[PDB]
Amino acid sequence: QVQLVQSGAEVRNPGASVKVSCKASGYTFTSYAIHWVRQAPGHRLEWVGRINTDNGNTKYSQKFHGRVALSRDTSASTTYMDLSSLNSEDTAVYYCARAFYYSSGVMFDSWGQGALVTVSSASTKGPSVFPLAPSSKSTSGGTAALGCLVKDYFPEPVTVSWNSGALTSGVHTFPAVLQSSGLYSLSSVVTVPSSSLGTQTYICNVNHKPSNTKVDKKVEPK
């Protein structure tokens, strides 16, 4: 019956700030401290800070360098988290949790659903396309693997075809990676017979509609 409800998702630019709320209900708000924990994509839980709901004194993790601030409103039973000077490394889900003392310590017994904060670029960024030269080191007996790397673009999505869509079999376009710089990057791979490398031309067609950019990269052997 203890419940913590947090505000919705937020999108910010590098340098801006964000405020996340955490309303508490089902218990005495001023008798239990509220902790804030963030979880970056593909990272472990990271403790942000603690605030006494009653006093209300705060305690912050030094890993933020005075960039985070906690506050509370007892009349609404809500704790707020402000994080200024945002950067792409701060892109994470931010949870609020209640500290509950037991006989031999304290635990985070109740958590909030979490609030997603995304510090993404304000402007569109077109992609750079580089040819992945055909290699037969990891392919089947008669085939070779060639591709092209679509590096540093924003935002999603991009469409990658081969030979203007004529080449469809063996095409594996991997999901994009959201790099720490806030930019996406993916690779598209095609496995073709090695007997057609010196005869057949292979061109990957990258299309990025948000940037109005099109690239036809010819993939040649070494």
């Binding site: 005495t28 401290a33 006494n52 305690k59 500290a99 003392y101 006989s103 031999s104």
Partner: peptide
């Protein structure tokens, strides 16, 4: 909390919600 509860049992009668509040007030590092 267990030792503070046994300590508060001598001064009088303290509810479980009240001993939680005072534990969180003095426990500065949490």
């Amino acid at each position: 909390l267990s030792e503070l509860t046994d300590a508060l049992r001598t001064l009088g009668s303290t509810s479980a919600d009240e001993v939680q509040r005072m534990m969180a007030e003095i426990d500065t590092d949490g």
